[PDB]
């Protein structure tokens, strides 16, 4: 119950114009109103002197304390609920599972079923707190259309959940245009408002971008636009405190495997887990740096009833 | 009857310029108009402020719902009609046949008659819904010119269909230039508009590319151009919801068999089935990962009257 | 005990208005009152004739001597207490550690754990003068939220300090808006007044700026605003004489690795150490020019209990 009910603010010019400001593309949550810069406050059809101060001062979501709260975060950070891999080995290498309030990626190759791996968690997300789940509704928002509800139905059987219930609990977009990607997120923001939505697979986030822009070296701007989309996801992170696990594509360096797709503005915070497919049905997935464990490795195999333990 | 009749939109500036926008290289289907990014909307001689908003807003093909429709896809995906191999074994390994609305490939070697195997389905495509067919007219658009209508005529006899009718139902291009490949697709788009065309063998799609470009290491750009062509095929996928089965060439790794021809931008979604020719007349064809079955194998032999069952 | 107790000035119009002038956004320390330009003195709601003269003349913090004190600085500069790296090698390359009364930066790539490296010192800062510490409370004020108190707790074990005490000693902000960055600093200024706060990791200082402004070439002004923020940090430097270590992001030059993020107005004063990650767990960090040693290099590896020595 993170959000301070969108425009919880009673006043500070809450009369129609401010409500229209929220009713605009502008994010509606308390956090959004508060987090925003003045550029953005004066971005769209509101009176800059009065509005900014009023809105900014008014929220006092604190926000202000900022550099306050020395090792109080330790009392908090501990409380952050960390999701469940479904390989015992996987979870050990994750050291507490894939985590909410971080944008966490996977550096996959071809054939490596990272598509497959991601779709699986989107089921565990549904499970109770004590069974390693987030007891929330769930975003997989796919740009390849790598989406098989059929495979997800198998996961239900494995983890003892009512099929039709589980499928109804998480919801999905094919969204082709590079601009559409940006667009989609804003309405998620709206969708996030209405109930507790828990964990999110944009998949792959890079893939719609790979092509359909990147005509050689008019790329300065490509990488600019990704930023915007990437910052928004971090905005989405703070707002609702939802897990964002975003899928990448490695693209060869021919001077093997490769760097994760499109390089530099994939920023430090987004914690990144790379999958490298191996002997027989087994596949191996070895965390590149996050803060977690400074590094580490570990295999596992995809199983008809979900990505699981190295057992045959 | 997927397409919303090209420019179904009555207005939103439909006056001559918009019609000329569609009458341009720009795709004409409702989906095309809607799917496109603004880069592309502002790609060619239209006024960016007015046009984009008008066209984009107007379509409302929804499009917008995107992350909506939680396990509603299950009600839909089920309805997707999945084509017929003609080896009972083949179909069992396919677990419902080669599927429409996906770009599905085959990783063939030399002598492996994958050329042959592909031409066969292009007949079953013609068959009624209940006999495993798609009741659609059909694209084989070959760059090797590996095209024998004679062999296809044999398939008719096997599957009890009127010869001259069947041959008239599917149609073919030799198209030599790497640029011609891209070009050809756009007019298909036009050809797709005019009637229900069902399943498509571009064959081999890589082969015209293999040479006639790839002068060593000015390949960054080779792999770029393939992308464009590959994205367009996925665009063609959404548009008409037609099966795209694209044929590859294996190319040795001398460090056996081999990786499918030109590597990385062959993307996860395109589901890939590899053929490996074997004892006597028999040949074996063992699905590399798609979502279908996480993996699995199975032989079969080419028979004078089509690719068939392992029976002698 | 650098600060002359904010408004140490007994008179010089200290009656209510001057106190309100200090009680304003305007910095409160003796140094702030003194250092300020008249533009800024006449910036906010004071009488320009009387106020300026009174305040300016009154401080006489000397200030005035300026070009005085020929190599007396040598008697002083020597006394400046210089913090402790925790790699013996690191400290040798630093030639006395990361230094207070300078804004010192680190030019990091992805995966290079500079995030990690910075969080570590924020512990040594706590240590006694003789053990290489600053015996002060500490600012890490993070914009990525790259903050793991958990990892910091490990540092305590390594350097034999009471866990809960150490964590209570240093304090942290996630602060998203580009304008918020500027805002946060002013209250630090207030927080700096109240006790001896010793060393400061703004982290990364560039990263909130990377995006969320820099829409192409309305950038002249971006770089202006950074200046302001950067000058304030130098203002903060003189005031309390506290170490400012600010983390950067390298941003590729595609005409490798890269220039530090956002170019020109990163000024000469900020002494800069760039980290370049290497063989296995090891990482190498090779001082770009400051005055220190005109250049030089040196590796080291991250160790579960802190960034440390080349030992296995």
Author numbering:
A (entry chain C): 644 to 955
B (entry chain D): 956 to 1267
C (entry chain B): 332 to 643
Give me lines lifted from the publication on this model.
The abundant ssDNA-binding protein, replication protein A, transiently engages the single-stranded 3′ tail, but is replaced by RAD51, whose nucleation on ssDNA is stabilized by the evolutionarily conserved BRC repeat motifs within the BRCA2 tumour suppressor protein. ATP hydrolysis by the catalytic activity of RAD51 allows the components of the repair reaction to dissociate.
Here, we have used electron cryo-microscopy followed by an image processing technique that couples maximum likelihood single particle processing methods with helical symmetry software to calculate a three-dimensional (3D) model of the human RAD51 presynaptic filament to a near-atomic resolution of 3.5–5Å, revealing previously unrecognized structural features. The helical pitch of 80% of the filaments lies between 95 and 110Å, with an average of 103Å. The overall architecture of the human RAD51 presynaptic filament with 6 protomers docked into the EM map when viewed perpendicular or longitudinal to the filament axis reveals that like RecA, human RAD51 protomers form a chain that encases ssDNA as a 1-start helix to create the presynaptic filament. The angular displacement (twist) between protomers in the presynaptic RAD51 filament is constant at 56.2°, encompassing 6.4 protomers per turn of the helix. ssDNA (red ribbon) lies between the inner surface of the protomers and the filament axis. When viewed top-down along the filament axis, the N-terminal regions are positioned peripherally relative to ssDNA (red ribbon), suggesting that they do not participate in RAD51–DNA interactions as previously proposed. The fitting suggested that, just as in the RecA filament, the presynaptic human RAD51 filament engages the ssDNA backbone, exposing the nucleotide bases for homologous pairing reactions. ssDNA within our fitted model for the presynaptic filament lies close to the filament axis, and most likely binds the inner surface of RAD51 protomers via the L1 and L2 loop regions which encircle it, with each protomer making three contacts with ssDNA. Moreover, our model with fitted ssDNA suggests a stoichiometry of three nucleotides per RAD51 protomer in a filament with pitch 103Å, incorporating 6.4 protomers per turn. We also carried out 3D classification and refinement with imposed dimer symmetry; again, no observable widening of the α-helices was detected.
